[PDB]
Amino acid sequence: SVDREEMIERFANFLREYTDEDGNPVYRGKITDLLTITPKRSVAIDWMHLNSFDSELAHEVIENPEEGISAAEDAIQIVLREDFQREDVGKIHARFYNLPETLMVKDIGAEHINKLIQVEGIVTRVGEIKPFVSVAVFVCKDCGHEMIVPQKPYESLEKVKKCEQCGSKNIELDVNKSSAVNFQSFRIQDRPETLKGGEMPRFIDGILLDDIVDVALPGDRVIVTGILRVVLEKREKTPIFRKILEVNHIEPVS
Amino acid sequence: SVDREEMIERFANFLREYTDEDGNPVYRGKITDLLTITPKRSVAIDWMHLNSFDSELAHEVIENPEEGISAAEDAIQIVLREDFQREDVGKIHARFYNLPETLMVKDIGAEHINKLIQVEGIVTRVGEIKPFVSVAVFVCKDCGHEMIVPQKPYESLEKVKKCEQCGSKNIELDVNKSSAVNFQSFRIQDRPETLKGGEMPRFIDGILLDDIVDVALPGDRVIVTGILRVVLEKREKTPIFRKILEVNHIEPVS
Amino acid sequence: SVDREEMIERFANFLREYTDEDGNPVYRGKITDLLTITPKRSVAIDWMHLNSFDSELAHEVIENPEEGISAAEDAIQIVLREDFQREDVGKIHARFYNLPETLMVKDIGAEHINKLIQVEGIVTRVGEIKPFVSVAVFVCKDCGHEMIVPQKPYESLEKVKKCEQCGSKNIELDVNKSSAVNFQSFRIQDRPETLKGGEMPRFIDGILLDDIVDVALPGDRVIVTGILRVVLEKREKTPIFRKILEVNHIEPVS
Amino acid sequence: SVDREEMIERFANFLREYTDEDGNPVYRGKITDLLTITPKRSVAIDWMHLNSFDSELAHEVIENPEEGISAAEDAIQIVLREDFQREDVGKIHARFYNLPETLMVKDIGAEHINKLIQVEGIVTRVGEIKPFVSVAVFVCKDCGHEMIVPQKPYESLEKVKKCEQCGSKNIELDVNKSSAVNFQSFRIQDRPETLKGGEMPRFIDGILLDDIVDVALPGDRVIVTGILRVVLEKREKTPIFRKILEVNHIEPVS
Amino acid sequence: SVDREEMIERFANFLREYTDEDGNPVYRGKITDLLTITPKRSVAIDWMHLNSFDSELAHEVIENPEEGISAAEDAIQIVLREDFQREDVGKIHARFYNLPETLMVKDIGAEHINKLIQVEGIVTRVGEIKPFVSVAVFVCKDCGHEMIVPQKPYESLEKVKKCEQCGSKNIELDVNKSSAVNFQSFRIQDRPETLKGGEMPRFIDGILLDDIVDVALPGDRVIVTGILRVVLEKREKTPIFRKILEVNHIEPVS
Amino acid sequence: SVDREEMIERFANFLREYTDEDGNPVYRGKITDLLTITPKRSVAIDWMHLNSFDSELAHEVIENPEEGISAAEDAIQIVLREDFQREDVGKIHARFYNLPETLMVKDIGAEHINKLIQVEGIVTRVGEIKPFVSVAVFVCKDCGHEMIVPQKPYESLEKVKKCEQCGSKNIELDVNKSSAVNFQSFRIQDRPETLKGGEMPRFIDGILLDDIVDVALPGDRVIVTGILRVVLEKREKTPIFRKILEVNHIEPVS
Ligand SMILES: [Zn+2]
Ligand SMILES: [Zn+2]
Ligand SMILES: [Zn+2]
Ligand SMILES: [Zn+2]
Ligand SMILES: [Zn+2]
Ligand SMILES: [Zn+2]
């Protein structure tokens, strides 16, 4: 694979240098647009673009999407600092779309676990929009020490048992110091027309965070990309994985 | 009974040597077929064939189906290595069919517990297909030690409390290192036509794993063979067994 | 048309005779590159070359790719024996490229079945690289007689029921006498970017054998040439013809 | 076509003379069996048998099933009289099976109206068994005159307005003089497995009379032959035909 | 307006002469195609084409769609006879699409009654496919006289009281002589997204006949053209019109 | 193999030369029967005859039925001109029968595509007898130039977009210059009686042209010979290959 430091470099280079068929510096422009008075909170990257410019890296995104996405976001940040002298920009997401293969929900095997997959389906349900504690901040009631603990929207809350400074077992989550983002669950499944007669359609539950929340309603036909996550299903006696799609990019089909 | 080492021997011998009424070396042929470009993941063995060739062993399959099946699978593996020079073949299941007795669901007594029974019925329900963690791999966050723990689809997840190398109570299940296979629950019961008027039909729940998942729909009339498992029913106050059929082979009736 | 006897000669001419715009015997050159420290197992023949030199034969490899390719491979083999005193080289593929017409996946029709087509597309997925028994040698264990069954990579392993000599059924596959090569499946489709608004992209499955496996990854834009095969579906429920592309030559699009 | 008199002749001849591949006089035997102490109330005729013996007649059965069946039944009657000296035998049905084409329910077009079609499907519903007034006998309360009026199980009761002898408008149906037979409605439709994904299965309602009543339960997979009848659907505003299958023969599939 | 005779003329002329931007004689070609081995049963005409060629006529189609469509169909027939020497072609529908205005369901006012409107909506429901008696044929049981009576899929069956030849009140509908076509009801309504918050969406019921039956499922977004029909709603005490869309052309939106 | 030039000669020999066990020039006889008061439009060539006389050519009509048949029909045509001074006779079909191998419908595989096969089966249904434009002659209305498009009965009417002479798009189909013949579709399947317990019977669709239409009815046991064609499905939703049998000769089973 490719270590983080070097991905950031390669990504930063891609954003700056990539140009399309007509010579348009697509991502330079997208990043420039971040200086507009009401900017976007993400930059969508066409996987095919990245694959034609630095293929080895493009495949790393699919193999290690967590590090891949993270590096890409770190690069956006340094391009904003080095090329636009903007520091206070806040989080900008890297959302990859147009992957080489589109799976049906039924195709999502366990060989995909923790990779970036692209799935086409119809939205069966959407949850209500709630605040997800993306960063929990715990505060000791004795020394007043602060412990930052990032969370994952598919795993249960990672608490702290004792203070990392004064060993005290008197800590609570500080609701104000903690950071919260929008969260919305949804479900997609294969449409019956895509299957054989009397075949039971399969489904998968996803998570939308931040700015891609509330972009789809039930009945919508979508192409999502995301990391396939598995967590142990507590509904079952025996160890069964419950699949969750942590969505990286979502758009309707046409 | 018969110890494992000797079963493997006897099984390997059976697979190589058995020939039917016309002199066809059935199982030699079935195993040869495993070298085709898209092979099966199991070898179905006609219990009657095995009984006519090594009857003592055939009865051992019914008495100790767990060791019996395992030995048969280990034999398949050594026949592939010794006779076909194939090592990387992966798991091939031994699925025994055509047992001497066919039970109705109502006939399944506790004298069958952990034996291989053959049941005829009609499928009342099928579950959704899920990934069952057939092999859990735990990883220590301190020494990075790896512990392999195989699972059973009818028992709850067997965790590990502390590291087996550095005694550390800081281990988690590694979702990527673990192996998962397909899983599907189903229910069969006796058809009313087979019973007396106003008799309440009885049912039993089964498990299908791997490649025999999704081979039956509700309304289907099947003959399954499988190990009868009992686990303590948590629904009841008092100790009651909940029967589960861990399916070894399934086919529709004709 | 041309019978295969005469093709071998006409090809062996072409290989020796053909000279480019500079008077170099290109294909004489390529043939020698098969005698290097580590050689090549293929000779890439430009179709335009064969056309400008023996237009009738060039038109023939398209109408009858199987005999066309086979005859050229026989000519390569006699030019080794006759012009370089080498008959130990083994199988050398003749891979034709730069054909007169280029199809999009959607343009593939019934008129191409068993003809050499050239398809431009993007790779959707690629399979695991596995061994394919390309020539099966069956040995009767009774009389010792050998039987040679050649295989097609798009059909399942074809066997022999009884010994053609002594009628016996006690036969086995001799893995040593048999020939195996690498196999890799892959899928290409038309690039959504070359299609109308909501036009579903057409896809086709390919086969790569021997020295052209592992040549491509998903996302690769390629030009394959190959024989269109139709194969009867394995699923025995009023089955139907699916199409496979047996790849003859594959290079990335320029 | 063929007039009634001549059909009866040809049918009578067929029953007597037909012999199968082994020289068995199948229908002679079936009719002989009618002299057993507890006889059947119908004779099933294999359409293929009749087609091989008197093809012109076999096609007449399908074209005019009402006259065809009737003639066949009249012939059975005269064979019983002329060859077995039995008169008091009662009604014996001619039930033709094994027609040349099997329709799915969705294939039943209006070009079938009043022809003998053969349909395969799954029974969705069965009605309760009721007595159908196959022959209504009306009796004048003035002159005591009796009027016989046969009925059809798909049309409403054909009454009489006035006495055919004394012109009196004082007639009622005589419940005792009238003849009643068993009647049972049922519904078959195509199974989802036979259709495309998300395709709405179509159905048709049938009538079973006399001795073929209560031979099928819901869930059963049947092949029925019958005359397709249409009557004006009163549920609709506009003129729509409601299809009814008046079953001639029914058997489960295998 | 324009009398029938003259419309047919003008239409026939349009079909023969019209050419598009590239000089393609679109409708000449569409009609030529009717001589293929498996032809269509309708010719779709782009209203815009007709408007650019004979605008006065195009507006007549909207004003009097019943005469307009009929004339267009009569013209198709005479073009087939005069230009292709085909008489036995059967009914070919004229289906106009792409009208100048697209109404939402809520826009369908009574000023549209018996005009050709074009509506966009989402299919809420579809009925089961039934045979509609498009032509009832009545037969006198006395003189055997035949009376043809065409029907409309939105009006109740138009019977005949007495024979038009022997004045006899003894006539019945002859189910075999009558002609039946496919029929399917459906409902479309405006999607909530197209309306204001908390606005109750409005709907309309349609009829599909013949070859445009079963071309839409619930959830489909369609653009239909059709004659708006009103019939007196029998559900209400007071005189209220029930709107019905007699569909002339339907296609999904993109 | 054999080029068509040489086939014509080899066939014209066979027709003149071949003599039976009694020394009669059978095919000379059959050719004259084309000059009777009312003649025949076909010459039924027994494959066994052609085989025992010119084994290489006989094997050729099977491998290349289209050129084989075509060449024989050219030879028939020159033997008329040369041996009987007749060149006004018009198309005479060469219909080959009594082929070496007989397939059941289920035995038809991809290896038969575009080869002459012989299938025994029973007729399930037969179509309406309609006209098929076998040769379309297109006349440009601007410059007067004629263009000849030959047709296949298993594809749709192929046309010409613009005049090859003057580039004009003002083209029309000249029905008089064009050739049409009768067409009838039919379906045969294996007889359930030659199949196992619950074995679904396989079916195939055939085409009868010209003088072999109306030759069979449902229920007829027949032996057809013909070219297996695969045609790309008209339904443009990832379409697939269906198989049609273009019938060369058909007779009832003896
Ligand atoms: Zn503290
Ligand atoms: Zn440890
Ligand atoms: Zn031998
Ligand atoms: Zn009276
Ligand atoms: Zn009358
Ligand atoms: Zn011209």
Cross-strand pairs, A37: none
User: CB atoms < 10 A from the CB of B193, how many?
Assistant: 7
Which residues in chain E touch residue F156, judged by CB atoms under 8 angstroms apart?
33, 36-38
CA-CA distance, D117 to D29, in Å (whole number)? 27
Ligand in closest contact with the CA of B139: 2
CB nearest F157 (choices: E19, E22, E35): E35
Contacts of residue D253 in chain F, CB cutoff 8 Å? Answer: 198
- For residue E29, give the H/E element and its range: helix E26-32
In this structure, which ligand is nearest to the CA of C144? 3
In this structure, are residues B201 and B192 in contact, taking their beta carbons and an 8 Å threshold? yes
Binding site of F, by residue number, is 140, 143, 163, 166
Distance between CA A21 and CA F114 in Å, rounded? 44
Q: Which amino acid is at A169?
A: K
CB atoms within 10 A of CB E196: 6
Residue A130 CA: distances (Å) to CA of A50, A153, A159, A208, A252: 34, 11, 20, 11, 23
Please give the structure tokens belonging to residue E42: 């309708």
Q: What is the CA radius of gyration of chain A?
A: 20
CB F61 within 8 A of CB F118: no
Q: CATH classification of E102-131+182-254 is 2.40.50.140, yes or no?
A: yes
Mention every residue, 6+ apart, whose C-beta is less than 8 A from residue A107: none
Q: Which of F93, F115, F208 is nearest to F154 (CA)?
A: F208
Nearest C-alpha of chain C: how many angstroms from A216?
Answer: 19
Question: Using CB atoms, which residue from E33, E37, E84 is nearest to F183?
Answer: E37
Neighbours of chain C (3+ CB pairs under 8 A): A, B, F
Q: Which chains touch E (3 or more CB pairs under 8 A)?
A: D, F
C-alpha–C-alpha distance, residues A18 and A166, integer Å: 51
> Which residues of chain B does C172 touch, with a Cβ-Cβ cutoff of 8 Å?
28, 32, 83
Q: By three-state DSSP, how is residue E159 classified?
A: coil
d(CA C249, CA E130): 55
**Closest of F189, F241, F250, F226 to residue F115, by C-alpha:** F226
Q: Which two tokens stand for residue F208?
A: 């009868």
Contact A219, A123 (CB under 8 A): yes
- Report which residue type is found at C135: V
CA distance F91 to D18: 44
C-alpha span between A222 and A225 (Å, rounded): 10
Q: Pick from D49, D50, D51, D62 the residue to mutate for testing the F interface (most F CBs within 10 Å).
A: D51
What separation, in Å, do the N-terminal and C-terminal C-alpha atoms of chain B show?
Answer: 35
Let me know: does B68 contact B60? Beta carbons within 8 Å. yes
Whether D58 contacts chain F with CB within 8 A: yes
Q: How many CB pairs under 8 A join A and D?
A: 26
CA dist., res. F15 & res. F45, Å (int): 9
Chains B and E touch (3+ CB pairs under 8 A): no
Which residues between 15 and 34 in chain B have a beta carbon less than 8 angstroms from any beta carbon of chain C?
Answer: 19, 22-25, 28-29, 32-33
Could you tell me if E135 and E149 are in contact, meaning their C-beta atoms sit under 8 angstroms apart? Answer: yes
Classified as helix, coil or strand, C72 is helix
**SS3 labels along chain D:** CCCHHHHHHHHHHHHHHCCCCCCCCHHHHHHHHHHCCCCCCEEEEEHHHHHHHCHHHHHHHHHCHHHHHHHHHHHHHHHHHHHHCCCCCCCCEEEEECCCCCECHHHCCHHHCCCEEEEEEEEEEECCCEEEEEEEEEEECCCCCEEEEECCCCCCCCCCCCCCCCCCCCEEECCCCCEEEEEEEEEEECCHHHCECCCCCCEEEEEEEHHHCCCCCCCCEEEEEEEEEEEECCCCCCCEEEEEEEEEEEEECC
Interface membership of A200 toward D (CB under 8 Å):
no
Asked if B touches C (at least 3 Cβ pairs < 8 angstroms), the answer reads yes
Strand, helix or coil for residue F97: strand
Which residues in chain B touch residue C132, judged by CB atoms under 8 angstroms apart?
Answer: 37
Q: A202 contacts in B (CB within 8 Å)?
A: 128-129
Please state, as a whole number, how many other Cβ atoms lie within 10 Å of the Cβ of residue E122: 23
| Contact assignment for F170 to E22 by CB distance below 8 Å | no
Inter-CA distances, B29 with B33, C169, C172, E67, E250, Å = 6, 11, 8, 74, 57
Residues that place a CB less than 5 A from ion ligand 2 = B 140, 142-143, 145, 163, 165-166, 168
CA separation (Å) from D109 to D106, D114, E129?
Answer: 8, 11, 11
Sign of the dihedral through C-alpha F9, F15, F16, F17: positive
Helix or strand (DSSP H, E) at C50: helix C47-63
Return the SS3 of E155.
coil
F183 contact E CB<8A: yes
| Max Cα–Cα distance, chain E, nearest Å | 66
Q: Is some CB atom of chain A closer than 8 A to the CB atom of C197?
A: yes
Chain B (68-97) residues lying within 8 Å, Cβ to Cβ, of chain C? 83-85
CA distances (Å), origin A164, targets A170, A172, C140, D149, E224: 11, 13, 75, 101, 69
Facing residue for A239 by CB, picked from B129, B157, B217: B157
Which residue, chain included where needed, has tokens 């009749």?
D50
Q: Encoding tokens for residue D62? A: 């399908």
Instruction: Kindly list the partner chains of chain F, i.e. chains with 3 or more CB atom pairs below 8 Å.
Output: C, D, E
Report the alpha-carbon distance of residue E149 to residue E36 in Å, rounded. 32
**Is there a contact between E83 and F172 if contact means CB atoms under 8 Å apart?**
yes
What does the DSSP 8-state code read for residue E249? E
Q: How far is the CA of E167 from the centre of ligand 5 (A)?
A: 6
| Side-chain-facing half-sphere of D14: CA atoms under 13 Å | 27
C-beta of residue F224 within 8 angstroms of C-beta of residue F236: no
Domain B132-181, CATH among 2.20.28.10, 3.30.450.20, 3.30.300.130, 3.20.20.140: 2.20.28.10
Min Cα separation C202/chain F (Å)? 7
Domains A102-131+182-254 and A132-181 share a fold: no
Could you tell me if A124 and A187 are in contact, meaning their C-beta atoms sit under 8 angstroms apart?
yes
Query: Exposure of B232 by Cβ count < 10 A (0-12 exposed, 13-18 middle, 19+ buried)?
Result: exposed
> Distance, CA D167 to ligand 5 centroid (Å)?
23
Contacts of B24 in chain C (CB under 8 A): 169
* E135 CB-contact burial (10 Å; exposed 0-12 / middle 13-18 / buried 19+): middle
Q: How far is A121 from chain D (nearest CA, A)?
A: 15
String of DSSP letters for E50-84: HHHH-HHHHHHHHHSHHHHHHHHHHHHHHHHHHHH
Instruction: Give the gap in angstroms from C-alpha B133 to the nearest C-alpha of chain A.
Output: 5
d(CA B179, CA A241): 11
Facing E32 at nearest CB: one of F153, F173, F183: F173
**Which H or E run includes A205?**
strand A203-209
D55 with F219: Cβ contact below 8 A: yes
Closest CA to B178 of B119, B136, B116: B136
Nearest Cα of chain F lies from the Cα of E23 at a distance, in angstroms, of 6
Residue C170 is given by DSSP the state -
Please check whether residue A51 touches C, CB under 8 A.
yes
Distances (CA, A) of A203 to A106, A184, A192, A239, B49: 8, 17, 12, 20, 42
Contact E157 D239 (CB under 8 A): yes
CA distance B2 to E200: 76
Structure tokens at A205: 């539950």
Q: Which chain B residues are within 8 Å of C159, Cβ to Cβ? A: 29, 32-33
Residue F144 CB burial class (10 angstroms; 0-12, 13-18, ≥19): exposed
Helix runs in A41-125, H state only: 47-53, 55-63, 65-84
Distance CA C134, CA C154 (A): 11
**Contact flag F198-D59 (C-beta cutoff 8 Å):** no
Give B142 to chain C, closest Cα distance, Å. 35
- Say which of A202, A233, A236 has its CB closest to residue B129: A202
Cα angle, residue C150 at apex, residues C144 and C154 outer, rounded to 5°? 140
* Distance (Å, whole) CA C26 – CA C32: 10
- In chain A, domain spans: 1-101, 102-131+182-254, 132-181
Nearest-angstrom CA–CA distance, E189 and A208: 31
Secondary structure (DSSP) of A29-52 = HHHHGGGSSS--SEEEEEHHHHHH
CB B20 within 8 A of CB B26: yes
Asked if residues C126 and C203 have their Cβ atoms less than 8 Å apart, the reply is no
Q: Tell whether C175 lies on the interface with B, counting CB pairs under 8 A.
A: yes
Instruction: Compute the distance between CA of residue B80 and CA of residue B89 in angstroms, rounded to an integer.
Output: 8
| Inter-chain CB proximity D48 and F219 less than 8 Å | yes
Token duo for residue B88: 């990387």
What is the C-alpha to C-alpha distance for residues A131 and B58, in angstroms, rounded to an integer?
61
The answer to whether residues F82 and F194 touch, using CB atoms and an 8 Å cutoff, is no
- CATH for C1-101 (2.60.120.10, 3.30.1640.10, 3.40.50.620, 3.20.20.150): 3.30.1640.10
Nearest CA in chain F to C241: F241
Question: What end-to-end distance do the CA atoms of chain D give, in Å?
Answer: 35
Q: Say if A48 is an interface residue toward chain B (CB within 8 Å).
A: no
Give burial (CB, 10 Å; 0-12/13-18/19+) of C181: middle
Question: Which residue from A101, A253, A254 is facing C124, i.e. has the nearest CB?
Answer: A101
What is the distance in A from the centroid of ligand 6 to the CA of F163?
5
**Pairing between β-strand B93-97 and β-strand F93-97 as defined by DSSP bridges:** unpaired
DSSP-derived 3-state class of residue E211: helix
Nearest-ligand number for the alpha carbon of A142:
1
| Alpha-carbon gap, residue A193 to E124, rounded angstroms | 18
Using the Cβ of A129 and the Cβ atoms of chain B, whether some distance falls under 8 Å is answered with: no
